[PDB]
């Protein structure tokens, strides 16, 4: 048919940068004067609403994508043909470029956005307009694509099925060990008196593992010969 | 200008400024000193805020204090000697310094000082003997212990013995019996060395500080 | 033609499109990770013009900053022999900062860029990559690479910063422009006294406040680098495991 | 036909001259390493007679001092079964100190030896070696070896030190000779208050200030030993590696 | 010819203990009154001169020895005869006895010397008379012998060629990780507010690795038999 | 019947009596070790009703308490697939506490149980065990397991504790019964001020003091768990070695 | 004969819980008024006596059990029969059940007992009535059974003979590494200004190793078949 598809990839990116862009604007508009005092009721309509929605929604979203992929897993994986595997990989590489973007928004944009909002309020609880997005939105999402990628690979590629790449295992799991970091880092002084770094570039190993599988599914012919 | 042993004195007054910078700790805890290249002059005694100051002292912020330092001369030369005070969390604050000139020979420098029991001792010399007398024996002893085994099974030899099966060619009593003996002697020499220096000087008090 | 591709155009064609995907997914990736780590520890000096001092900032930022660069290096150069490791990471950071600095620090809350602009990294990042490009060794890189990285930090920041280190008289007291910029544009949680900047010691002699700072910052970065190189290695692990 | 030596005299001859070279290069070696380490952490109590107190000094010096001895042991006794490990190290130090104490502390700056004389180590050092010689086990050595080493520190220093723990009356205040010696011979950066010495607590009961200090110092040295034994192992590694 | 040479060793020892002995004296003489105040111009003639000289000299000394040994490397090392190897080792053991002395001077004498000078001045900058010698003299030298030793073995002994003993690698590189220690240990308080031990007895391994080679280049004959 | 047993009744009979001895020798075992560790670090909160606050205690006890449970789990479940690891350790502690609380805190010195009763652990311990029982994964256990464990701690302590959190008026000041119990039954070494309990901050918003505390306590326990799982592994080592 | 003996186990448990129960009582009685002030002479008769006795007694008890077990070691261990091994193991499991109880008393009872005595005195020295028992009694004992168990295995079971299980070695040696902990934990503040956890569940390994031997000394017959 063809190996490279990309149709899938674009739907993710397009659907994402949009949702975040809506959000950045929604927070531009209701951040300023609707989310400045939590004891007001327009906070409940414009922020405390989003919170109460996303969490349950994300939580289901995640277990959704999980069950589906497992359910639609290729029960006879080892049989997979050299073209179909190569195709599958290219979809895997796709999941990772969406994971990529999800990582950007969650972990850079909405994370260092929080920094500036700490210079703007005095905080009515730990639920700011910035936290609703950073913690209970942009992170959960990015974590869910993470799990998606993990599960897709596991149920489509013979290598990631019968295994667990420790690399991918890390990538899929350390998002649940950022809250211990980025979160509690904030309750520094309050949680203090009673008293280097563990990170997720596990993607290195994961793309390296992918790379090895490509180098495999091209004969001596394509390999040496076509690309000297 | 001074002779070796000649009892000069540097003195003065100082005001603890009021807008004491964040940069430096509270002078709650401080120490008076004389700023000189080594002990070119001994310090016989010194006083600040109308007290003997051989230890740490408090300065309150905004007062002034008076001080003086008795300096017996010791080293042949021309040394620019400052009044100096240091602060806990701060560092040295260096004051006025004047060229002082010693003449004579260091050879002749003495103190001395007077013990509670009565007697006198030249600090410039006192005790130095006993130190050597107890150290240098033990240093020889240690070096003996090494030489002994180095020439009794080589390095290469013993490495090769260890390397092949054995070992036990290298050690094994009476190598052990040597040990047990040398050990037992050592504990003894210490027991002795302690008991004696316990009779010599049966007075003694902990370092005075605070 | 080239199985499991139908043509060569299908091969060379796919390979090419995958290459982009990788470089891009791998751009952030690191940027994302690198940013969150950097921002949690180096802060803070990288937010505020009135934090960028003479001692602390030119110390902590090189030391914390070398981390993902070294780990990035141990990934590109080991596995692809591509000499853009440090620069790949450093720049990723610098974009991820800047975007946010503008769009949010400014465009959301309206602190003016002159207050919120990031520390410059790319000169040292280049220098690092070129010590590894020239001598093929990460051991050499770890020594003369990371030393270089430390020194260049302040020098490559001076062009941006000097501007605001100009003096102004303010109710019969001196300020720098930065001091003032910070003073003007009110931060609801940023009292001077939190700053973590040079305030002077009796132990300063010279006329050296920055030289020592940038040296110290290089020498330490040597160790950070080694550790971060090897973590760059464990992080690149193709190990597969049996149970969870 | 003694190959690749021509004679036995050439073999036994070379072996002998090499043996010396080793023992000597290996003497310092350790002395050099051991010293720099010891000096940076134990200081300091080992410079000044007015630091050698009743609590701190008889604690930190055994605990910091057991290190290279334990690593030195793991090298001689493991690989040559030679029972002079600790003593080889301990002494190496003592020399390197003393030489410098004399030549420099005295001969350069003219602090008198009674002020700048080093802590005594060789008794414990012997004690340690002989526990390893008798029981062949470093695990026993680590326990009853390092305990001993701890206890014998102060006892074996007392002979040198007592001398300066005699009382003198000074403007109606008590001092020890040491207190005074330090007071006399002016150190340009050594204010009492920096001293790091016993100054007394409400929690002292007895009449035990030194017993407890030397016990504590032995029980800790047990751990420092184990760790430094195995470091003496990694440090003994004949591993060869592929890239730098 | 003969295995043991020693002529080489003596040249180093003699050349060294002399150069340090000159210096100790020169610092005895010009330490006291010529290097007591940095703002004086007799400091520039007697200390600040030495500094400016040694570094570039040392730096070239080092790259010198390095290129030379590599250049004059035995291009066909594996072929080396059992006598020649044995001779070569004995030269290696030689380098290490000079490394030994270098270590002594740089790391014990001139290092604890600095201790006493800290009781003598108040420091005009970090460049004392003691630091010129300790840091930019006695260390660099000791570091350059170290590099020598390493490179000699590498280019003369098959074992050290095609390798890198990790032990020797350490020995040759950790000298560039003492500055981080012994140096910055000094800017303790000044560099402080903004906030066991890694050492070089790597020689252990190195002499152990030498030892194994000797134990090899003596047959069962010399071995068991001559030295039981 | 079955060698080296004479009968089946000899086999099944022995097998059975050993099982008991194991389970028993293994009960304490852990209890003994767990207790000493727990008591040395979580003190102290677990001794005194007037230490059991809203922030510290519901934080440090989950965090120190997970340790031997995780290590216990790594032992039963890996090697026997027995789902009582956490519970097995938690209860052991609870008994070994309780007995001594009664028999000694009370029966030897007469502080009334209301002052000296321990923190409740079993509900969380159950929860852990079942997250490991359901998902066969110690990775998932390490996450949702140790999160649950943190949260439940206070909820499952509230039944016991509420009682003493009642208010009494005391010379025109407020106390809780607990505050008072502590005040009444004199501890010769327990001044309020040593307490290490909630005393208030300007950074508290809400109305949240315990929720945050118990979340924080869950989140941190996730890491303690991992580390302590793997330590449960090294501790299970069947490795045998050559020398000591 | 028979594998399972147990007679030995009871002797220990009985002889033990009794000696601890006596002491608890004797401390009940003489704790309260006789050991409340150390400067008194009824302290010397009732506590400072116990101390002076037990240590030398313990110290000899230990080297005793040690020497005896070594002496009576099975010189031809490897030859040992399947039944006699099996029996020997059950004796080992026995030692471990006493080690169990010793651990209980020494490390939980008399350890957390000390907690409440700290609320009762102000300490005349480090020798309380509680320390005499905790430190110089309940621990040494629990440590000496530990040693026993270790040496028994070593001199009766081929596996523990020619070996040292690291697990067991730990078990037998870390009791001399709790003093560093539990003890110095106390001289916290006094020993302070001049400035996770290493534990002993090594028994895990030890029972794991025992278990493997059992699994061996039952054929496929007993194994698979009798216990499915
Ligand atoms: C130095 As070669 C290539 O002969 O191993
Ligand atoms: Zn399969
Ligand atoms: Zn070769
Ligand atoms: Zn210095
Ligand atoms: Zn106690």
Burial C129-145 (b: 16+ CB within 10 A, else e): bbbbeeeeebbebbbbb
CATH code for position B27: 2.60.120.570
- Would the CB atoms of B156 and E211 count as touching at under 8 Å? yes
Is residue C87 within 8 A of residue C21, CB to CB? The reply is no
Give the single-character DSSP code of B3. E
DSSP track, chain D: -BTTBSSHHHHHHHHHHHHHHHHHHTHHHHHHHHHHHHHHHTTTTTT-TTT--SSSHHHHHHHHHSHHHHHHHHHHHHHT--TTHHHHHHHHHHHHHHHHIIIIIITTT---HHHHPPPP-HHHHHHHHHHHHHS--HHHIIIIIHHHHHHTHHHHHHHHHGGGG-EEE-SSSEEEHHHHHHHHS--TT--TTS-------TT--SS-HHHHHHHHHHHHHHHHHHHHHHHHHHTT---B-S--
Decide: E161 in ligand 1 pocket, CB within 6 A: yes
Mutate to test the interface with E, among D29, D48, D71, D224 (most CBs of E within 10 A): D29
Q: Establish whether chain C is in contact with chain G, requiring a minimum of 3 CB pairs below 8 angstroms.
A: no
Residues of D with CB below 8 A from F243's CB?
137
Decide: E162 in ligand 1 pocket, CB within 6 A: yes
Burial class (CB in 10 A: 0-12, 13-18, 19+), D204: middle
B77-87 β-sheet, strand order? B2-3, B91-103, B77-87, B30-35
Is residue C116 within 8 A of residue C101, CB to CB? The reply is yes
What topology does CATH give the domain C1-244?
particulate methane monooxygenase, chain B (1.20.1450)
Neighbours of chain B (3+ CB pairs under 8 A): C, D, E
Q: How many domains is chain A built from?
A: 1
What span, in angstroms and rounded, lies between the C-alpha atoms of C209 and E125?
11
The closest of F149, F167, F171, F154 to F221, measured between CA atoms, is F149
For strands B2-3 and B91-103, give the pairing.
Answer: parallel
The closest of G61, G223, G205, G226 to G147, measured between CA atoms, is G61
HSE, CB side, 13 Å, CA atoms: give it for residue C122.
Answer: 7
Q: Which chain C residues touch D if contact means CB-CB below 8 Å?
A: 137-139
Centre of ligand 3 from the C-alpha of residue E158, in Å: 7
- Would the CB atoms of C200 and B90 count as touching at under 8 Å? no
Is residue F215 within 8 A of residue F61, CB to CB? The reply is no
The closest of C53, C44, C48, C49 to C177, measured between CA atoms, is C49
Note down the domain range covering B43.
1-110+208-210
Centre of ligand 5 from the C-alpha of residue F95, in Å: 21
Our CA-based measurement puts residue E112 at a distance from the nearest CA of chain D, in whole angstroms, of: 7
CATH code for position E48: 1.20.1050.50
A186 contacts: CB under 8 Å, gap ≥ 6: A126
- Quote the tokens at residue A85: 């595997």
Interface of D with E in 193-222 (CB under 8 A): none
* Residue D44 bridge partners (DSSP): none
Is residue E228 within 8 A of residue D54, CB to CB? The reply is no
CATH code for position B119: 1.10.287.710
CA C18 to chain centre: 28
Neighbours of chain D (3+ CB pairs under 8 A): B, C, E, F, G
- Quote the tokens at residue F33: 């070790």
What are the strands, taking DSSP E only, across F122-176? 167-169, 174-176
- Quote the tokens at residue E174: 């950790």
Same domain for B67 and B1:
yes
Note down the domain range covering E152.
1-228
Is residue C100 within 8 A of residue A134, CB to CB? The reply is no
Q: Residue D128: left if φ>0, alpha if ψ -120 to 50, beta else—which one?
A: alpha
Is residue A167 within 8 A of residue C238, CB to CB? The reply is yes
Rounded alpha-carbon distances, angstroms, from residue F30 to E200, F72, G16, G107: 41, 8, 20, 11
What span, in angstroms and rounded, lies between the C-alpha atoms of E103 and C103?
57
- Would the CB atoms of B90 and C199 count as touching at under 8 Å? no
The closest of E62, E65, E137 to E107, measured between CA atoms, is E137
End-to-end CA distance of chain F: 43
- Quote the tokens at residue A174: 């350390």
What span, in angstroms and rounded, lies between the C-alpha atoms of A203 and A206?
5
What span, in angstroms and rounded, lies between the C-alpha atoms of A50 and B172?
80
The resolution, in Å, is 3.3
> How many other CB atoms are there within 10 angstroms of residue A221's CB atom?
12
Q: Any idea where the domains of chain D sit in the sequence?
A: 1-244
Residues of D with CB below 8 A from F244's CB?
137-140
- Would the CB atoms of C201 and E189 count as touching at under 8 Å? yes
C205 touches chain B (CB under 8 A): no
Nearest chain D residue (CA) to G188: D203
Q: How many domains is chain B built from?
A: 2
Residues of E with CB below 8 A from B38's CB?
119-120
HSE, CB side, 13 Å, CA atoms: give it for residue A205.
Answer: 24
**Closest-lying ligand to the alpha carbon of G133?**
5
Is residue B67 within 8 A of residue B52, CB to CB? The reply is no
Same domain for B106 and B5:
yes
The closest of E211, E102, E201 to E147, measured between CA atoms, is E102
Centre of ligand 4 from the C-alpha of residue E175, in Å: 17
Output the furthest CA–CA distance in chain B (Å, rounded). Answer: 79
- Quote the tokens at residue C67: 């981390």
Is residue E167 within 8 A of residue D241, CB to CB? The reply is no
Q: Which of E154, E162, E164 to mutate to test the pocket of ligand 1 (most atoms within 8 A of CB)?
A: E162
- Would the CB atoms of D134 and B179 count as touching at under 8 Å? yes
What span, in angstroms and rounded, lies between the C-alpha atoms of B46 and C50?
46
Output the furthest CA–CA distance in chain C (Å, rounded). Answer: 82
H/E run at residue B100: strand B91-103
Query: Tokens 């007037």 — which residue?
Result: F50
F17 contacts: CB under 8 Å, gap ≥ 6: G4, G6
CA-based R_g, chain B, Å:
27
The closest of C56, C96, C89, C95 to C72, measured between CA atoms, is C89
What span, in angstroms and rounded, lies between the C-alpha atoms of G143 and C61?
52
Is residue G130 within 8 A of residue G117, CB to CB? The reply is yes
Give the single-character DSSP code of E187. S
What span, in angstroms and rounded, lies between the C-alpha atoms of F203 and A190?
6
Is residue A163 within 8 A of residue A200, CB to CB? The reply is no
Centre of ligand 1 from the C-alpha of residue E93, in Å: 22
Query: Tokens 């007291």 — which residue?
Result: C173
H/E run at residue F122: helix F122-134
Burial class (CB in 10 A: 0-12, 13-18, 19+), E29: exposed
CA atoms A20, A26, A29, A32: torsion sign: negative
H/E run at residue B77: strand B77-87
What span, in angstroms and rounded, lies between the C-alpha atoms of C140 and C160?
31
- Bond before F57 cis per omega within 30 degrees: no
* Residue F189 bridge partners (DSSP): none
Q: How was this entry determined?
A: X-ray
Is residue G34 within 8 A of residue G46, CB to CB? The reply is yes
- Quote the tokens at residue A203: 């993607």
Burial E108-131 (b: 16+ CB within 10 A, else e): bbbbbbbbbbbbbbbbbebbbbbb
What span, in angstroms and rounded, lies between the C-alpha atoms of D224 and C233?
31
Length of chain B equals 210
Q: How are the residues of chain B apportioned to helix, strand and coil, as percentages rounded to the nearest 5?
A: 30, 30, 40
């Amino acid at each position: 048919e063809s190996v490279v598809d990309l149709r899938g990839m674009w739907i993710g990116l397009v659907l994402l940068n949009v949702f975040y862009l809506i959000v950045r604007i929604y927070e531009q508009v209701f951040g300023w004067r609707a989310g400045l005092d939590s004891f007001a009721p327009e906070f409940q309509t414009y922020w405390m609403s989003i919170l109460w929605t996303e969490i349950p929604l994300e939580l289901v979203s995640g277990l959704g994508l999980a069950g589906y992929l497992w359910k639609t897993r290729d029960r006879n994986v080892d049989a997979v043909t050299p073209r179909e595997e190569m195709r599958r990989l290219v979809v895997l590489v796709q999941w990772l470029v969406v994971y990529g973007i999800a990582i950007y928004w969650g972990a850079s944009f909405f994370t260092e956005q929080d920094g500036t909002w700490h210079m703007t309020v005095i905080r009515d609880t730990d639920f700011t307009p910035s936290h609703i997005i950073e913690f209970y939105m942009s992170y959960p999402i990015y974590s869910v694509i993470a799990v998606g990628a993990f599960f897709y690979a596991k149920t489509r590629i013979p290598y990631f099925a019968h295994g667990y790449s420790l690399a991918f295992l890390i990538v899929a799991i350390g998002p649940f060990m950022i809250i211990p970091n980025v979160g509690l880092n904030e309750w520094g002084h309050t949680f203090w008196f009673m008293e280097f770094g563990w990170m997720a570039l596990g993607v290195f190993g994961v793309v390296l593992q992918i790379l090895m599988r490509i180098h495999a599914l091209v004969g001596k012919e394509g390999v040496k010969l076509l690309t000297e | 200008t001074v002779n070796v042993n000649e009892e000069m004195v540097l003195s003065g007054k100082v005001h603890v400024f009021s807008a004491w910078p964040q940069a430096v700790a509270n002078p709650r805890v401080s120490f008076l000193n004389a700023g000189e290249p080594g002990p070119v002059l001994v310090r016989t005694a010194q006083f600040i805020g109308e007290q003997f100051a051989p230890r740490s002292v408090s300065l309150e912020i905004g007062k002034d204090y008076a001080f003086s330092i008795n300096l017996r001369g010791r080293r042949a030369g021309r040394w620019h000697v400052h009044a100096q005070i240091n602060v806990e969390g701060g560092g040295p604050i260096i004051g006025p310094g004047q060229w002082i000139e010693i003449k004579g020979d260091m050879k002749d420098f003495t103190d001395p000082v007077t013990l509670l029991d009565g007697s006198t001792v030249d600090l410039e010399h006192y005790g130095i003997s006993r130190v050597y007398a107890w150290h240098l024996p033990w240093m020889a002893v240690g070096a003996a212990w090494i030489f002994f085994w180095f020439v009794r099974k080589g390095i290469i030899t013993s490495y090769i013995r260890v390397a092949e099966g054995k070992a036990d060619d290298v050690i094994g009593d009476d190598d052990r019996r040597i040990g047990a003996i040398v050990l037992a002697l050592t504990i003894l020499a210490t027991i002795v060395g302690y008991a004696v220096t316990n009779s010599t000087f049966p007075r003694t008090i902990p370092l005075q500080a605070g | 033609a080239v199985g499991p591709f139908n043509s060569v155009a299908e091969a060379a064609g796919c390979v090419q499109t995958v290459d982009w995907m990788l470089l891009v997914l791998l751009f952030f990736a690191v940027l994302g990770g690198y940013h969150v780590h950097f921002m949690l520890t180096a802060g803070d000096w990288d937010f505020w013009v009135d934090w960028k001092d003479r001692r602390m900032w030119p110390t902590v930022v090189p030391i914390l900053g070398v981390t993902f660069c070294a780990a990035s290096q141990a990934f590109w150069w080991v596995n692809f022999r591509l000499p853009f490791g440090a620069v790949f990471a450093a720049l990723g950071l610098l974009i991820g900062e800047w975007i946010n600095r503008y769009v949010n620090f400014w465009g959301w809350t309206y602190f003016p860029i002159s207050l919120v602009f990031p520390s410059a990294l790319i000169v040292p990042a280049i220098w690092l990559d070129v010590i590894l490009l020239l001598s093929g060794s990460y051991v050499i890189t770890a020594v003369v690479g990371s030393l270089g990285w430390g020194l260049l930090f302040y020098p490559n920041n001076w062009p941006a910063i000097a501007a605001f280190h100009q003096a102004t008289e303010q109710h019969g007291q001196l300020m720098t422009l930065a001091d003032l910029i910070g003073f003007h544009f009110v931060r609801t949680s940023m009292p001077e006294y939190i700053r973590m900047v040079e305030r002077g010691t009796l132990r300063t002699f010279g006329k050296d406040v920055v030289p020592v700072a940038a040296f110290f910052s290089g020498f330490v970065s040597m160790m950070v680098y080694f550790l971060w190189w090897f973590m760059g290695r464990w992080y690149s692990t193709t190990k597969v495991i049996d149970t969870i």
